[PDB]
A paper describes a structure:
We work with glucose isomerase (GI) whose nucleation mechanism has been suggested to follow a two-step pathway, and for which groundwork on the characterization of the pre-nucleation particles has already been performed. The steering torque that guides OA can often be attributed to the dipole moment of the nanocrystals. This is not the case for GI because the net dipole moment of a GI tetramer, i.e., the crystals’ building block, is zero because the dipole moments of the monomers cancel each other. Our in situ data for GI exposes crucial interactions between nuclei mediated by OA that determine the material properties of the final phase.
We show that R387A crystallizes in both the I222 and H32 space groups. These nanocrystals are facetted and their FFTs show clear diffraction patterns that match the predictions based on crystallographic data obtained from macroscopic crystals (cryoEM: 6.7 ± 0.1 nm; standard deviation, n = 33; X-ray: a = b = 6.64 nm, 60°). From this observation, we can determine the lattice spacing along the c axis, i.e., 8.3 ± 0.1 nm (standard deviation, n = 10) which is 5.7% larger than the 7.83 nm c-spacing derived from X-ray diffraction. Based on the crystal structure of the planar H32 crystals observed in cryoEM, we identify the plane as the dominant orientation. The 3-fold screw axis is perpendicular to the plane resulting in 3 distinct GI orientations.
Numbering used by the authors:
A (entry chain A), B (entry chain A), C (entry chain B), D (entry chain B): 2 to 387
The structure:
């Protein structure tokens, strides 16, 4: 039995199991979910928490009076279930006003509005106890080369994130930003298309310590990149503030399959890296139950996300704890990889004849890496076949 | 006539027109070129310069006595032709000893050797007057998840680049490093797979000011990314120390077509961005004349790289100088994009009712971006159809 | 001036210039277009004709009384403008009932309904003078392996197309079917994903002569395939009954850019092949004016489709008519490619010693193909740079 | 223990466990294997058979005297081990003479030589008891549009295959052809890029019954296609004469990982389809032990191919035999998919009011497909987690 508990820190976005099934070629196949029904259903399945866009919780252009009701109802369901809200985000993509972006709209008045909408939701996020605010610049980019000067757009992107960091430090809020990269869709190309682009951009912000990345499995796999490798770079930089778990079958539209579906082997190595690095953040699922399913299928899909995480975890632990795997890791010299190349300095390296002149290149070349035996042990553990 | 001159700063790698045509399924279709013949042939076509891997100039495991001869012969041809050497690089991929990498080989003795080989070639690079040293970590990565701990590998990557920066500052050399990203091939995944990953990594080096990126058109297009957008981010960060120009038909093996072939529209926007940013570095071609061609085809292919750059340049200039394009850029509000969102500060933004409360979202939403008319003007200029 | 006349046979679907701009992450940015208005506007721009899905013309769940009002209004606009209707299609993707397909829905009663919906629209198509009925099995496929037995689905696919061919021969209708391949979106994988799969399936139908393909530029490029190559195979097989022209930037979601946008080179070679094969069918545009645009941008986008076709046509003709190109085609032995390999028969081939034992493989190997000089001439012509 | 017996019909080409590790950017990492040794080692691991290119067995430009020495030694090893040779193929890609193709070389004398080379090896294939001759047109295609008229090339392709079918029927040989599709590499685009294109082409051959497809996992996945779907279409058409099993991580260069590696889910559904269709052909592995490995890694990699097939086979059987899965297949109406849509005929369909006018579209639309519960059961079985 791989039932999830409140300590496993599994979370879901109101727009994940609430997805109505509208796609580029098809109408809604499910009615809208009450955020309160989702909180209750997720608690029953063993979720720890939910996340939201402003617009998922508060219908766009709500009065301040209605706004309160929606929040108080949500608050009640959280108090009843003990469900947490670790992360919130702004919808800067749905409303037609954002057709050219939020923070990097060519229209300056739209950029100003985008910021006012985000700040309003940061206040709410903090009242609900969220420690991470996500920015997904889903409309930040172009279909055509002349439509967007990317250097001016990155200036506007920087200006926006710095203004938000300023707001957060002036209010003394205890909340950090996580930028969520995506290479394309709904735009022909999106700015900060990958984990790398987003990490590089953060290093140019007034207050870089307030910002990290929220990488999504599917987003990196849409550019054909190794999601585990990107996560490893985000950890190496100390910038993995959040994660979005889902499935994707390689390079095509953003599928948002339940976690474990799509690239199962990458899902294995992902969980192996998160567990072995001791990532303490929430295990957030940003997935869409396919539009073929009714509400029973929606909850089965959500339950599968958590099950597949727990099954993969157990197999990754078994893999790492197996003495035959540890011997195989030494045979492949993963231990030598973890050792400094030249802790003796550069002078000692320049003087060491074993490092160049008297290096036996042919003897080193002939040493097998034994990576195939190691990978078959990983396969045997993943499949439970030893 | 779009003949190239010595001021256009066109350069070529000895391994570009020297490619013998060996591919994964096929033997060499051309004999090896004498580096001296390539220098002479490139000068005739109007090239400004050549670049080299250590191994292109000095056959692997040459005596110091032979090493000199090869260098003196090369030096003579450069002096005769007045051809420059603006960039040099190390071959850390061909020899079987590098089958698991150079700087991030699991084997510590291979990492030490990789560094000694690179340092030796930095000395030569400086003697030949190169101001940029390129690292292409072509063997840095894995085919399988357990073979490479990416965090340990990035530590070894950092250690290597810091040791090289230390060497360069201790010798008082006037040379900068450019890291060349690639997503895959010859490895299943390569570390620092994109411009973004490489920019982020540089920000963690002891001496970040000594390092930039050498992005390649084909490399970013192999991950399905917008090469112009990546170049714009590299410029915004002040990190475009070099560039590799070639062609690629989307997501597949590294084709290295002559510049202008593959994604012609991206080539147009690339030249438009390089020219309008006033990039002053060399226009370096890293391409492979297809293996179908003899030496006449090789030199036609090289000449085409330079021709296509000059033709694209002229069309991009005409595009930017055309009053109808300038009016179309204002209609699409590219000028508003270049204006600060809130130079009035955050307090003024929080107080401005036109930025939220009294913002007419529906009136802003209804404004067409007029991006299609702008893009058809760009198309008309590229095609010379106005 | 690259003006479009009636002889150009340019066509557009109601759903193209009428796309409201709803995508998976955003609401409509434009109000709906009255089909009559679209007919009148497309006539103004120099279109020869329009195409429609049943549901574009007749709102889903219309009374027969309303049905006739919409058809009579449409009929009037066609009469007034002299616009033709060469092609019609069924919407078997939008309504939630089709979430698992039309012809290959797991639910037998949905398959039966899909057929009754299609047959009703075939009657209308013929009344309006259409000679081609298009089937786009957009919902035929799966997100998961257990959901769809592909052999059973192809039996149901075959059954459906044979029943439709039976109906058409019973009514003596003067109308042929064109199957429109697509690899994915909105399904994870779609059945008959390419031109090849659709051609192969047709050869197993009761009446193969009634069926061809309707290939779409963007659809083949979403699988990273060469659209000109696929079109050449469809022509070689005498199966190119229709074509859908648009733009796509490699492997990602279905973009539906205006023709000429995306892969400009492939657009050049496409027009070169259609013109030189004398394809006599309509030049149909299935594109979406991006959601950034208002109605002026919509009509500019449509006008650009036709403009870009006529520019490419002129440059391809100049290419083929240039004596230097014809000499270059002989140098690359395109004329030898057009000659039978062994019109002397198998026995003469087996007996010919110049064909094996007396074949100088090294002398043949050394012959350059001169493909690069030929391709630079094609580039010079496309760009108008000779 | 998932041991491989002779009944498993596991096969491997000489070129698989004998790949020396040369790639576009690196030298050989392993010495050549004597074909005899490979036969002896593959028998030890529980292989049933081997396959070969002419050039793997007989070095190019061998005397007839040497030719017989290599064949007699090979023959002896087969006799000693009882290893079968079910399949043979021609090398029409390695030698520089094939730089523009074999059967569709622009040079007519190269096409003639290609045929004479193939026919010579068909004689050998039959002497060694092969029932399948594979054609991989690896050099059939282009890097540029002007280099190859695809209609002329398909005429030459047809001519070649018809001449070979004529030879085979004249000799009364008991041998069928399997065409092996590949989308690209080593050519920019290859002719017959997918299973669909190859099936469609076969239907235009003089003797279609002599020809089927040899689909490769990695080849279809390089175009981002569903390999199980393509295999199902090949079975539906009765054209699956052979199969090549390996691994591939989505859209990039041809990786040739061991079977099970790359897309593990697709490997599961593939084995599920081969087993449940009762495919009786050999399970042939066309893979490359990565160049990181020595000979122990080579044999581990080969053993892993067979192990991973037998694990998947066991999990697919358990999946299909599980009563909860059979109930879930009925809940998802896979049984309704297997029923004729209208065995009552077109007239009864046209007359049935439950099929249109009396069809409750909203009631049909509301029915969940329960595909997610079915897919989680498939996942649980694959992982051995029930
Ligand atoms: Mn997503
Ligand atoms: Mn997300
Ligand atoms: Mn390259
Ligand atoms: Mn390069
Ligand atoms: Mn489309
Ligand atoms: Mn279409
Ligand atoms: Mn292969
Ligand atoms: Mn193969």
């Amino acid at each position: 039995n791989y039932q999830p508990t409140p300590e496993d820190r599994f979370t879901f976005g109101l727009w994940t199991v609430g997805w109505q099934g509208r796609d580029p070629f098809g109408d809604a196949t499910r009615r809208a979910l009450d955020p309160v029904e989702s909180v209750q259903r997720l608690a029953e399945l063993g979720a720890h928490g939910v996340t939201f866009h402003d617009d998922d919780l508060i219908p766009f252009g709500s009065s301040d009076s209605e706004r309160e009701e929606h929040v108080k109802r949500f608050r009640q369901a959280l108090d009843d279930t003990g469900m947490k809200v670790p992360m919130a985000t702004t919808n800067l993509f749905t409303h037609p006003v954002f057709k050219d972006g939020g923070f990097t709209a060519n229209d300056r008045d739209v950029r100003r509005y985008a910021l006012r909408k985000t700040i309003r939701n940061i206040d709410l996020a903090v009242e609900l106890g969220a420690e991470t605010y996500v920015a997904w610049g889903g409309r930040e980019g172009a279909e055509s080369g002349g439509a967007k000067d990317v250097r001016d757009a990155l200036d506007r992107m920087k200006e926006a994130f710095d203004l938000l960091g300023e707001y957060v430090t002036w209010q003394g809020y205890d909340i950090r930003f996580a930028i969520e990269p995506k290479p394309n869709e709904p735009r022909g190309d999106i700015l900060l298309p990958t984990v790398g682009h987003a990490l590089a951009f953060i290093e140019r912000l007034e207050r870089p310590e307030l910002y990290g990345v929220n990488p999504e499995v599917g987003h990196e796999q849409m550019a054909g990149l190794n999601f585990p490798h990107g996560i490893a770079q985000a950890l190496w930089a100390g910038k993995l503030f959040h994660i979005d778990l889902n499935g994707q079958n390689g390079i095509k539209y953003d599928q948002d399959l339940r976690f474990g579906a799509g690239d199962l082997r990458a899902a294995f190595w992902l969980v192996d890296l998160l567990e072995s690095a001791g990532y303490s953040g929430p295990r957030h699922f940003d997935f869409k139950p396919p539009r073929t399913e009714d509400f029973d299928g929606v909850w089965a899909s959500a339950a599968g996300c958590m099950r597949n995480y727990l099954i993969l975890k157990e197999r990754a632990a078994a893999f790492r704890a197996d003495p035959e795997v540890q011997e195989a890791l030494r045979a492949s010299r993963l231990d030598e990889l973890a050792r400094p190349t030249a802790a003796d300095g550069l002078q000692a390296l320049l003087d060491d004849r074993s490092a160049f002149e008297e290096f036996d290149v042919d003897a080193a070349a002939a040493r097998g890496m034994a990576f195939e035996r190691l990978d078959q042990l990983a396969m045997d553990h993943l499949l439970g076949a030893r």
